Symmetry: C5
């Protein structure tokens, strides 16, 4: 039902940013793939993904794709998929990551707070206490109580169950709109965590434009959620 | 379609408190798992459970989980599942309980009265006459006529059909709101039945707050029931 | 997908009264099972039956059940099931009845008239001409034209195909309410047919109460029908 | 998923009149089965056919039945099930080396005329020529949906001689008069002498008794 | 099993797909070309999930999903707008067939909804790799840089290219809201240049009003099915 077309990357750092609240993970992951100059290395293939190519820089691309450079893989989705299919995809991802002895599984997500703050924060959660301690060492606050739905929640749990080091970074956000500023906050933490130096200035500079170009996608996603 | 990830506990006392009327069983079972300081020992795993983790005390947790201490297992669910899936889960639970020669299978449920009483009572029903007699020996009234829908009804029947000793404790409740006071009534009876030392005072103390925090969940659950 | 948990009963007379028009067959079959002091002897088991126990006299019981005494089996359902599941259950029932060489397969059903009559009648139909002649010998009128939907219709056909003696008794009824009086008419005929000694007076005496306690179920059933 | 309970009839002429526009084929096929005094010889059996017996002359009958073979259905079935049934029918007809496969259908015109016509189409040019050799006009362009369309194509593809006869009709109502037009052509084609007068005589009454079935069918479409 | 292609081998096929889509641009173009090049019906798609029907064309029963053929060219036509999973299954069988016969080119004809009137509606192109993009640029076709292509055309572009075939989509700009035989005519002109054919589009332009009227229900049908 789902096939991963994805070469083995030994000791992969796997970063997942599927669509979710504020599109925080989606914006962050797309920004990182582009800024780190990643190649398209694979995709998810299923009869249950609706028929489509996205054209990006004059190249056809499938809607669920993996970008790669060196030991880093970033997973992106341009459609918000139904729950059973998310579970099937998570299961294949975890089998892959087990197989290659992934070093880290990091989900990028949003946390809808329902009101404005002058400084939106980033929370973290780890798949075991060891990963919580790593996050605390980086000055990330640990989420104590709450819920993480969707691919990010499923991966956190399943990857940890498979004995992998798993994390979620959650950018606080309004809850009602695409939020490239929250995405920028998440990227800055990911930078610290992986020792990368990706500047988020281009993201903050285009925040208004990105908010506009993704407003329909966000609308699409919210409609699909409430089924 | 459903797998139980759950180590064998020989001679288990298995207590089930899935969401249902008043969230009586849900409140009771969550309270007990916390008050008896239980560990998370397993979960239900299925592609048909929607993708999520719950974070509890800085640990990721799945929505359908089993807590354990000594010979006791408590089963909890944070989502109200469709009927076929509840049947599949009940089947795997019963296979597990057969396998380990469970001593008791006890469901905690609510019974919607449809009006207020000054004193809501607790009823009992057993999977055979022997269990009914045990309940009567504790001073629990036996339900003579009615229906028990959902997990609690199914387990009562399926566990008994597997030759296990099965019971349901039913806290009378309004029928249309979260009822931690009915939950407390059920916990008091369970305490007596199993010789535990759990006070319900902390539950009664947080009744108002619990009723508030669960009011959306209750709403969710009633909506899902009307479809199904 | 469906399993019958049902011991073999040799030369069974199998009476089916699943929910249908007027709940005529349902009331009749429940009444008979109680009046003949039957034991619960089996049930239908399926993941597609929604999760529940019914409590009856302080015993948990499943919603699709078989009662038994001597050579008689009565099949009862408390839920109105979707069509494909009815067919799957009918198929397992007929396999069972083939297996045990059932003597008779008798469905109890209602026939909606669409208006009030001072005297509602009972019609009959047999799986073959032989069973029609038996019914005529008892003074039951043979339905010539019409349709019988649901379990009763399926069983009549499938059981007769399997070489079994098959019948439906149809109590005329309004069509849109529970009708214990029609049920009582059907029970009287069934009594004659099987040489039983069941009085319908307790049914007629509780008619009003039964109509009231089943009014929800009837509503449920009509909703599900579309 | 579908089983045909149907004995072999070597060199069968198979006539299909499942429910469709105007119930033209349905009325025609039922009329012929009755007027030629046919026996019930088989049925379609499937868990996906809803549970029922029809009582006809004091005998229980299934809703999809076979009575020359005439195939009748008293329910309007979903598309996938129609395909599954067509496939079993064609396997059967291949197996017995059927001589002819003839569907009776309606064609919705969308308005009244004083004289509604009958069109024909054949599975190959040979069958078109047979139809022309009597004064049946060949449909040149259009759509035949449902069992009749599927059988025309699948039976042809299996090397069988296939035809559809289409009675023009309003499109909106049961039409025993269109059915009568179709029966007259089928008479000529098979050398039968069935009078359609009893059909025309009861046209009103038939239109009334089938008005709910027609309503049912349009909803399901 | 679920979809079977009944289609003889045509070695080094040029395969042209024009399934229903926006403006019915591909559909009008492909039907026009099949007729103008005098093609025979050479095969069809067979599936229990295609609803039961025959179309009658020139007194011949025909199935709703068909292939026309002459010499090395195959044109694929559909008269019904199919659900997504079934489109994927059909694309998979098409690609297997094209692999098997070592197809020379796979060309999808599609529309691109602009949402307003232009005095001159253009044609865009996209290729399955950079080599095909360069071919299209050599013909003076503008390369689509960013966007999406849904339906059979999008799926084929990607899956054919993945199988190592040369794949293209030609996209005729159109209003987005109506059958557009003019856009179809624009696409046919480009296809002419690409394949070295001389098919005049004058008959198409001459009947544009009539075609728009005859297909207006089909276009309505299709838009309904799309959500």
């Amino acid at each position: 039902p789902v096939n991963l077309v994805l070469p083995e990357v030994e000791n992969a750092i796997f970063i997942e940013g599927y669509p979710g609240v504020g599109l925080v993970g989606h914006i962050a992951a797309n920004f990182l793939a582009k800024e780190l100059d990643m190649d398209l290395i694979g995709y998810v293939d299923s009869l249950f993904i609706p028929p489509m190519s996205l054209i990006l820089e004059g190249r056809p691309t499938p809607p669920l794709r993996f970008y790669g450079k060196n030991n880093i893989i970033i997973a992106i989705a341009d459609i918000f998929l139904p729950p059973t299919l998310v579970n099937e995809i998570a299961k294949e991802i975890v089998n892959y990551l087990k197989k290659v002895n992934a070093e880290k599984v990091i989900s990028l997500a949003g946390m809808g707070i329902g009101f404005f703050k002058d400084t939106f924060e980033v929370w973290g959660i780890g798949g075991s206490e060891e990963e919580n301690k790593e996050l605390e060492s980086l000055g990330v606050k640990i989420l104590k109580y709450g819920s993480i739905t969707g691919m990010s929640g499923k991966l956190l749990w399943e990857a940890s169950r498979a004995g992998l080091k798993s994390y979620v970074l959650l950018g606080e956000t309004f809850g009602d709109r695409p939020d490239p500023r929250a995405a920028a906050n998440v990227v800055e933490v990911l930078n610290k965590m992986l020792g990368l130096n990706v500047s988020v200035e281009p993201l903050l500079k285009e925040a208004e434009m990105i908010e506009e170009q993704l407003r329909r996608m966000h609308e699409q996603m919210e409609e699909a959620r409430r089924k």
